[PDB]
Amino acid sequence: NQCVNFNFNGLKGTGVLTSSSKRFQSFQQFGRDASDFTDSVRDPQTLEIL
């Protein structure tokens, strides 16, 4: 819930909070969408997705 800069092996600075993240299949890390905007990334060691 703050304007942060995350480095989940890639750099981008936005805000963060908890995601449902239904669409995570086949060893996925970042849940991109149309126009390549980044949302729904997961912790690289745990399974929780923000």
Binding site for other proteins (CB under 8 A): 23, 25-26
Q: How far is the CB of 26 from other proteins (least distance, A)?
A: 7
Give the integer Cα–Cα distance in Å for 5 and 7.
7
Q: How far is the CB of 35 from other proteins (least distance, A)?
A: 16
The residue among 6 and 31 lying less far from other proteins, judged by its C-beta, is 31
Spatial contact of 38 and 32, defined as CB atoms under 8 Å apart = yes
Q: Which is nearer to other proteins, 6 or 29 (CB)?
A: 29
